[PDB]
Write a protein that binds this DNA or RNA. Structure first.
Ligand code: K
Ligand code: K
Ligand code: MG
Ligand code: MG
Length: 135
RNA sequence: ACAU
DNA sequence: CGATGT
């Protein structure tokens, strides 16, 4: 119904899919960029969306913040809930880095706790998520 | 079909 | 138009 403005919003940006993947987290209210991941040479949209949420979890936990996280990705929200990123991306030398980060993100989820609500950004009602890459 |  | 996903 209503945007929870006291929140973190995340989004992925890519050059190709699969292709170069980056992501960032912003203050939903102000747009302030809170974290930005260095571009990853090959990954998928959904792996980036997943990494963005998990990074947001780690970011908020380190800062003792109970803010929720918004993502517009049905897929990544489910993957985080499951603690399992069910990507189809081939594992090879070229995809080694993104798969390493995804593996490590799952591992973090399986060794830490959090109460952070992970919320679906309702793009059809509210427009583009505040972390959008204007892409 | 829905979400990217 | 193509790809990633439930
Ligand atoms: K975009
Ligand atoms: K499809
Ligand atoms: Mg997105
Ligand atoms: Mg976007």
């Amino acid at each position: 119904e209503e945007i929870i403005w006291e929140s973190l919003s995340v989004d992925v940006g890519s050059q190709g899919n699969p292709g170069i993947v980056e992501y960032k987290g912003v203050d939903t209210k102000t747009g302030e960029v809170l974290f930005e991941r260095e571009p990853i040479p090959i990954g998928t949209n959904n792996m980036g969306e997943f990494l963005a949420i998990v990074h947001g979890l780690r970011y908020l936990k380190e800062r003792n913040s109970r803010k929720p996280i918004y993502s517009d990705s049905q897929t990544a929200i489910k993957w985080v809930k499951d603690k399992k990123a069910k990507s189809t991306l081939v594992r090879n030398e070229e995809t080694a880095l993104i798969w390493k980060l995804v593996d490590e993100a799952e591992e973090w989820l399986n060794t830490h706790t959090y109460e952070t609500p992970i919320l679906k950004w309702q793009t059809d009602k509210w427009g583009e998520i505040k972390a959008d890459y204007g892409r």
